[PDB]
Amino acid sequence: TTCCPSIVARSNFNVCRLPGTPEALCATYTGCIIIPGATCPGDYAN
């Protein structure tokens, strides 16, 4: 599951993913994170 710290970060994550870039690279690029669960915390609410 991916979780993002802000709106901007999610929007940039979704563009990063368009060419097929791995989630893990898009995470370090944007500040978003990958978690094994399904419930994002309050500081990664977007």
Resolution (A): 0.5
Task: For residues 18 and 37, give the distance between their C-alpha atoms in angstroms, rounded to a whole number.
Answer: 24
Domain ranges of the chain: 1-46
How many CA atoms within 13 Å lie on the side-chain side of 29?
A: 15
CATH no. for 1-46: 3.30.1350.10
6-44: burial string, b at 16+ Cβ within 10 Å, e else: eeebbebbeebeeeeeeeeebbeebebbeeeeeebeeeb
Handedness of CA 20, 24, 28, 31 (dihedral sign): positive
Task: For residues 1 and 15, give the distance between their C-alpha atoms in angstroms, rounded to a whole number.
Answer: 17
Task: For residues 42 and 17, give the distance between their C-alpha atoms in angstroms, rounded to a whole number.
Answer: 23
Task: For residues 46 and 41, give the distance between their C-alpha atoms in angstroms, rounded to a whole number.
Answer: 9
